[PDB]
Design a protein around this motif. Structure first.
Motif, short mmCIF file in Angstrom:
data_model
loop_
_atom_site.label_atom_id
_atom_site.label_comp_id
_atom_site.label_asym_id
_atom_site.label_seq_id
_atom_site.Cartn_x
_atom_site.Cartn_y
_atom_site.Cartn_z
N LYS A 15 13.89 60.57 39.62
CA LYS A 15 13.22 61.35 38.27
C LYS A 15 13.19 62.92 38.31
CE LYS A 15 8.48 61.37 38.09
NZ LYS A 15 7.42 60.26 38.12
N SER A 16 13.41 63.51 37.07
CA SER A 16 13.79 64.74 36.82
C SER A 16 12.50 65.75 37.10
CB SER A 16 13.99 64.74 35.11
OG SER A 16 14.14 66.02 34.82
N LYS A 17 12.76 66.78 37.55
CA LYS A 17 11.70 68.06 37.81
C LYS A 17 11.85 68.97 36.77
CE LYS A 17 10.76 67.38 42.55
NZ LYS A 17 9.31 67.16 42.20
N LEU A 18 12.53 68.74 35.48
CA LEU A 18 12.58 69.68 34.46
C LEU A 18 11.29 69.42 33.30
CD1 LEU A 18 16.37 69.16 33.90
CD2 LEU A 18 15.11 71.15 34.60
N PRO A 19 11.01 70.35 32.51
CA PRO A 19 10.20 70.31 31.86
C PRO A 19 10.50 69.25 30.61
CG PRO A 19 10.40 72.45 32.20
CD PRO A 19 11.36 71.87 32.80
N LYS A 20 9.58 68.37 30.16
CA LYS A 20 10.04 67.34 29.23
C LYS A 20 10.85 67.88 28.10
CE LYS A 20 9.36 63.22 27.65
NZ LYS A 20 9.57 63.13 25.98
N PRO A 21 10.72 68.91 27.39
CA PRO A 21 11.62 69.38 26.31
C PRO A 21 13.05 69.48 26.75
CG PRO A 21 9.33 70.44 26.04
CD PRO A 21 9.39 69.84 27.39
N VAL A 22 13.16 70.20 28.04
CA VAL A 22 14.44 70.13 28.68
C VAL A 22 15.11 68.87 28.62
CG1 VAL A 22 15.80 71.35 30.15
CG2 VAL A 22 13.97 72.48 29.17
N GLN A 23 14.09 67.87 29.33
CA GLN A 23 14.80 66.84 29.67
C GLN A 23 15.41 65.98 28.11
OE1 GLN A 23 12.30 63.88 31.33
NE2 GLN A 23 11.43 65.45 33.08
N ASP A 24 14.60 66.20 27.20
CA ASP A 24 14.92 65.38 25.99
C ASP A 24 16.38 66.16 25.40
OD1 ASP A 24 12.82 63.71 26.18
OD2 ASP A 24 11.54 64.82 24.87
N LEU A 25 16.58 67.69 25.94
CA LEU A 25 17.57 68.27 25.30
C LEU A 25 18.74 67.65 25.90
CD1 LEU A 25 18.81 70.69 23.59
CD2 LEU A 25 18.28 71.85 25.63
N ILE A 26 18.68 67.46 27.18
CA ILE A 26 19.78 67.01 28.06
C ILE A 26 20.23 65.68 27.73
CG2 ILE A 26 20.65 66.47 30.38
CD1 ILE A 26 20.16 69.43 29.53
N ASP A 37 24.81 59.66 34.55
CA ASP A 37 24.21 60.38 35.65
C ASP A 37 22.82 60.73 35.33
OD1 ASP A 37 26.42 60.55 37.16
OD2 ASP A 37 27.38 62.44 36.30
N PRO A 38 22.18 61.11 36.36
CA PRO A 38 20.53 61.43 36.35
C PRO A 38 20.25 62.77 35.47
CG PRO A 38 21.04 60.98 38.72
CD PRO A 38 22.25 61.02 37.76
N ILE A 39 19.44 62.93 34.74
CA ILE A 39 19.17 64.05 33.69
C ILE A 39 19.29 65.40 34.68
CG2 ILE A 39 17.26 65.30 32.89
CD1 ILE A 39 16.16 62.58 32.04
N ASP A 40 19.07 65.52 35.66
CA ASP A 40 19.03 67.00 36.60
C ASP A 40 20.54 67.20 37.15
OD1 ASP A 40 16.23 66.89 36.06
OD2 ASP A 40 15.47 67.20 37.99
N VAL A 41 21.31 66.12 37.15
CA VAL A 41 22.83 66.20 37.57
C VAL A 41 23.48 66.71 36.02
CG1 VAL A 41 25.09 65.07 38.39
CG2 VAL A 41 22.76 64.66 39.50
N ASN A 42 22.88 66.26 34.91
CA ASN A 42 23.77 66.57 33.76
C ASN A 42 23.26 67.87 33.59
OD1 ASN A 42 25.15 64.09 33.15
ND2 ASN A 42 23.81 63.17 32.14
N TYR A 43 22.11 68.19 33.70
CA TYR A 43 21.67 69.79 33.46
C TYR A 43 22.50 70.91 34.36
CZ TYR A 43 18.61 73.88 33.79
OH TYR A 43 18.04 75.12 33.82
N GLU A 44 22.88 70.45 35.48
CA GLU A 44 23.77 71.40 36.28
C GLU A 44 25.09 71.41 35.80
OE1 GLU A 44 23.04 71.13 40.47
OE2 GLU A 44 20.89 72.04 40.29
N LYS A 45 25.53 70.33 35.24
CA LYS A 45 26.80 70.59 34.50
C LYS A 45 26.82 71.65 33.37
CE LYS A 45 27.90 65.50 35.43
NZ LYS A 45 27.82 64.32 34.52
N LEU A 46 25.89 72.06 32.83
CA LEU A 46 25.86 72.78 31.60
C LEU A 46 25.80 74.24 32.25
CD1 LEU A 46 22.82 71.44 29.69
CD2 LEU A 46 25.38 70.97 29.27
N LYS A 47 25.79 74.60 33.27
CA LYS A 47 25.86 75.82 34.29
C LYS A 47 25.15 76.82 33.57
CE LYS A 47 28.81 74.33 37.26
NZ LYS A 47 29.17 74.72 38.88
N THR A 48 23.97 76.55 33.02
CA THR A 48 22.98 77.32 32.00
C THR A 48 21.63 77.15 32.47
OG1 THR A 48 24.65 76.97 30.27
CG2 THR A 48 22.50 77.79 29.56
#
Ligand SMILES: NC(=O)c1cccc2c(O)c(Cc3ccc(C(=O)N4CCN(c5ncccn5)CC4)cc3)oc12
Length: 240
Positions: free
Chosen positions: A1-12, A18-29
């Protein structure tokens, strides 16, 4: 499960379709939710409210979420322009399917193999001061009514101001950008400064420019380093 805030999870989830937090890191942002209650959020909501063009009447816009963004390496890339005059907070819209690339690689100039169709001043990075002009480029629909739009700090410097299409081979000496002059402009008396960047959030007025091909302004830079992406908005399009 993600440790990102819900609005960020929804954005991703929106960006990667891949898991949300792995897709987050691909953005390099770095992505932060902007507090609803904040001065920044107030300013951004006003910019959206005031700069919807009268001719873009197929929809109205509601801001769902505002994110503050910092691309990896952006500080050092933008450094050579960070002190140029005439830095403005401007809109850039794009299809949702483009945002993984936009955040990971930044806005880029279209390659030689792309048509120059749609680029009145040649291939470059295009921005608007009217939210709806950019929001049109999200290509949302009744069936798919949520879109993403950027606010970039754009280092415009001395603008080469044009009224008709011209694919300029090179900027004139001492010029840093092109501005296409529209018939309608945000009222310049209402400009405010946010963190040293001009925000043209005035309601649209007649510019007094005659003999122009453009209803609304547009701004073009030809060096990717002149853009500092600052905010990403999730918008609801309410179609009429
Ligand atoms: N996008 C804006 O907010 C904007 C604002 C003001 C003027 C223009 C103006 O004239 C344009 C030009 C335009 C011309 C062509 C296209 C266009 O067709 N594009 C192809 C898809 N695309 C993309 N694909 C993969 C990765 C990244 N991006 C985006 C570009 C899109 C926009 O865009 C404007």
């Amino acid at each position: 499960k993600s440790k990102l805030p819900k609005p960020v999870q929804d954005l991703i989830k929106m960006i990667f379709g891949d898991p949300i937090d792995v897709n987050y890191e691909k953005l390099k942002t770095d992505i932060k939710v902007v507090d609803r209650d904040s001065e920044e959020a107030e300013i951004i909501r006003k910019y959206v409210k005031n700069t919807h063009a009268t001719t873009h009447n197929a929809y109205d816009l509601e801001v769902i979420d505002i994110f503050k963004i910092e691309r990896e390496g952006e500080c050092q890339r933008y450094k050579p322009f960070k002190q140029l005059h005439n830095r403005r907070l401007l809109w850039h819209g794009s299809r949702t399917t483009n945002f993984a690339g936009i955040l990971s690689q930044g806005l880029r100039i279209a390659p030689p193999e792309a048509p120059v169709t749609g680029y009145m001043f040649g291939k470059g990075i295009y921005f608007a001061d009217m939210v709806s002009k950019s929001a049109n480029y999200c290509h949302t629909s009744q069936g798919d009514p949520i879109g993403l739009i950027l606010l970039g700090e754009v280092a415009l410097g001395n603008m080469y101001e044009l009224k008709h299409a011209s694919h300029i081979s090179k900027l004139p000496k001492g010029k840093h950008s092109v501005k296409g002059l529209g018939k309608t402009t945000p009222d310049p008396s209402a400009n405010i400064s946010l963190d040293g960047v001009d925000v043209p959030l005035g309601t649209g007025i007649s510019s007094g420019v005659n003999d122009t091909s453009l209803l609304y302004n547009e701004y073009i830079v030809y060096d990717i380093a002149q853009v500092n992406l600052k905010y990403l908005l999730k918008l609801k399009f309410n179609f009429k």
